[PDB]
Amino acid sequence: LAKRIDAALILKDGRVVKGSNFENLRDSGDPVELGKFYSEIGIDELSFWDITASVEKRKTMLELVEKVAEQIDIPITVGGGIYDFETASELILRGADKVEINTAAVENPSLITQIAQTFGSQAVVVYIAAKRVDGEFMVFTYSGTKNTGILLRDWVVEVEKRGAGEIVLGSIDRLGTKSGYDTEMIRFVRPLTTLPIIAHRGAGKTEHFLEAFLAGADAAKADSVFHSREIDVRELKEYLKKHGVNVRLEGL
Ligand SMILES: N#Cc1cc([N+](=O)[O-])ccc1O
């Protein structure tokens, strides 16, 4: 395939947290206008990740999905507080192409075969959060705090086997850093699974993305780095092409 540049939008109350620095938008903080803007300038897939806990927070997502699905041309993934089949089913049907699950996946791994059987494996993204514990990659859950004792070697083969469509590979050690994708972790996972692998956490500069794809990543996601305008998405794509990565450009 080619390699994707996925962009990720963190939501509270259907708002984009800290918004964005594109002064040309009408509502920097509006996910719909931001998301559709990223789809006009190079992003290949978008993530809508909701940090809302609240009472009517399942509605605010089903709302925004509906508004987003009529407007945005590229694939959309949703995750944030998705713990059961009800919530995913309702989200895919309201307009979500893929639903992300994590803790609920590790706690009942058949929720992914469940979502898969109904909506197709392509609709199921398993986010795996891992950090080194005593020289050994472990899967963590609950926002990367609960050391589940499942080592990643095995979770990556289980996830594939249970029917997931793609994995987001997030290195907890890189949260907030801007040193680069954990390319050791990517290289460690790469032979364990034929599934598409989305690199996440670390991105700080252009060249980090070239590193991520040589480590075997099928895609790289970042967020703040694009919204702050540290890395201009179009620049990022001309670079990746300059040095032999297969990425889709536009050319006007
Ligand atoms: N994808 C993703 C994602 C996950 C987390 N998270 O599992 O805390 C936060 C922000 C994100 O964009």
Author numbering: 2 to 253
Can you list sentences taken from the study reporting this PDB entry?
Computational design of KE07 involved construction of a theozyme to catalyze the chemical reaction, which was then grafted into the scaffold of imidazole glycerol phosphate synthase (HisF) from Thermotoga maritima. This initial KE07 design (Round 1; R1) catalyzes the cleavage of 5-nitrobenzisoxazole, with 103-fold rate acceleration over the noncatalyzed reaction and a turnover rate (kcat) of 0.018 s−1.
The mutations in R7 and R7-2 (Phe77Ile, Phe229Ser, Ile102Phe) result in further optimization of activation energy. In this structure, we observe both configuration A (three subunits) and B (one subunit), as well as two additional configurations (hereafter denoted configurations C and D). The four subunits in configuration C all had product bound, and were the only chains where product was observed. Four subunits were observed to adopt configuration D, in which Trp50 was disordered in-between the well-defined configurations, supporting the idea that these conformational substates exist in equilibrium. However, in later generations (R7 and R7-2) evidence for turnover was only observed with configuration C. By R7 and R7-2, configuration C (which was the only state we saw associated with product in the crystal structures) becomes the dominant substate sampled, with configurations A and B sampled only rarely.
